[PDB]
Design a protein around this nucleic acid. Structure first.
Ligand SMILES: [Zn+2]
Ligand SMILES: [Zn+2]
Ligand SMILES: [Zn+2]
Ligand SMILES: [Zn+2]
Lengths: 188, 188, 188, 188
DNA sequence: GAACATGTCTAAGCATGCTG
DNA sequence: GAACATGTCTAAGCATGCTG
């Protein structure tokens, strides 16, 4: 069986979609977050129908390039050495029921929190993600772009929905977003 | 009985076809993959009808030239010395059920994984292959072109489908593809 | 007592001097070696008078900048993780009597080999040093320039001579030497 | 103690010198032999005074470049796999008292034969060396130039004389000698 | 926020065993 | 013996965290 997780969008029967509200800036044209290391990066969860009780929200990173897709995305040794295991790239802050998973078969890391419906009178649910390395970190991502895959799962483990977005963790998110959007217009 | 495996295309009752999505680049005119050694090279499996449970996907290399077709394709001694047995040229990455076979009668190497139907909502299945020598490696392929033969087999061992593509593992796939396509146009 | 080792040149009663013979290139104007990581970098030992039997040759790195001089120079965690202890920056190759020292009081690293007089008919002695991080390595030298201090010591531990040279370990030694010499001429 | 053998010319008290008499061609300007793999390459031994009984003649290869000098020169794995141990690069043919040595401390290979004075009426002594890899062999010399060091040693192990010459083992010695001599004249 | 930093990428040219 | 082969080298430009 594949040890490479699917990245294909599956908005499913619940109409699952992500939203994004500088330390952080999202490019719709590129479907790509640009953010700074270890600074919280809010992601909104939107649904058309209410998921069942016990639904979970999982995040996982994979390398976007075909030559790297089968390699597990990990924290670099420098940032490892200085609740979350130090090897995990993606953390969730501000949640009392975070679980960190090291898959015993695929060795992939993921971080999971319960799905909480918006409060009476609210429109969406926000999760506070944190990326603990730069995209450029030697011995970690090493300048290789990643995707973050967000899956909505029921308590039985059924996939209910899947979305993903590219991430660049970098020192200058505004600069680098402008550069990439301009490159797209001129050479893409 | 022959110890030379058939290379003839047999797209069979399931409508079995290969797809190909630079470290690697595929030439449709040549039906030939150009890729770099030890860098993963994705191959898509397409079918018109769903194969039975237990279907397997086998890959095997053979020399394309008639003067070399009866010689087993193997890893060169240099790359052998530095799950897959070190003598095998072709590996599969990213799969938890890979099997490597050394045929006890023909001495041919092959690598097999279970056929997995595309996920609900997907269109095809990708296998992450890896070639561990350059076509030029002394004491291995020694500049001899190979074909990779992909067979779809049921659990009983019946051939269900067969496809093949030429491979050149080289340092400069883009350069070498351009050269060979130009040579085809001018002198083929 | 100080835990910062002296860097002051002491060419002493034996007339101790260093010589330097691209993966490496020495700038006399800057008294600075430019070299690549993990590539051997020969240093010549010259003396006017023959040192006693049992003389030893020690190498130690220290940060050149006053704000960093009291911090021990160490290998970065990435290059540590992939005879010499993995925390040591400076190795000696090609010698059967190397000793690596972690000072129990100062925590400084050094590497020592016996002094061998030139062979009958020779003029100097070469030691094959190796620097296992770039000056830029995150979590190690972190772009801070270092000096290497070479001391000639008798077996009793008396200082006989001392010399030092700046080091920049970098990807492009020729480029970076040209840049720094030009900057000296224009802005120094 | 150094595990790097000296290459410095020492023609010594016996006036020891080498002579060289296409599969083989010697460049005096470059002090460099150009020869083909596994084809015998005669080297003449000249002396002014007769060495004592029991004198031996040793040959050893080292890498010429400073970045490679501390690495032992070995046969590549391909030519290893197809009296001399298969790991040795340099063989002596036509001698009944050849000894092959793997140094237990330095791991360096060498090949030794007795020194035989020229026959009554002769002028020099010829040894038939054979290089069993090309300079270009992957996993062996890998395009790195070598020197061959020839030492005259007494039976007690005293060094009596030392000479050396660069070697390029290649498919086209005449071509490559012409190219290198021209490069010397134009760009050296 | 503009400029500097510095390991990496890229394309043209070099390499060197092999082919015709 | 001249031309082709094909992994490698080289220099200019790109990269991206850091400095001023
Ligand atoms: Zn990091
Ligand atoms: Zn190989
Ligand atoms: Zn480092
Ligand atoms: Zn060889």
């Amino acid at each position: 069986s594949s040890s490479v997780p699917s990245q294909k969008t599956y908005q499913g029967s619940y109409g699952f979609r992500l939203g994004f509200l500088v330390t952080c800036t999202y490019s719709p044209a590129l479907n790509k977050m640009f953010c700074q290391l270890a600074k919280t990066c809010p992601v909104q969860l939107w649904v058309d129908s209410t998921p069942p009780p016990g639904t979970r929200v999982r995040a996982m990173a994979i390398y976007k390039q075909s030559q790297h897709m089968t390699e597990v995305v990990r924290r670099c040794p420098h940032h490892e050495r200085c609740l979350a295991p130090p090897q995990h790239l993606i953390r969730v802050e501000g949640n009392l029921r975070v679980e960190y998973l090291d898959d015993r078969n695929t060795f992939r890391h993921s971080v999971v929190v319960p799905y909480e419906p918006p409060e009476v009178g609210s429109d969406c649910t926000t999760i506070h993600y944190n990326y603990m390395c730069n995209s450029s970190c030697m011995g970690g991502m090493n300048r290789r772009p990643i995707l973050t895959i967000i899956t909505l799962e029921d308590s039985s483990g059924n996939l209910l929905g899947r979305n993903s977005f590219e991430v660049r963790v970098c020192a200058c998110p505004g600069r680098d977003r402008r550069t990439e959007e301009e490159n797209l217009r001129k050479k893409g």
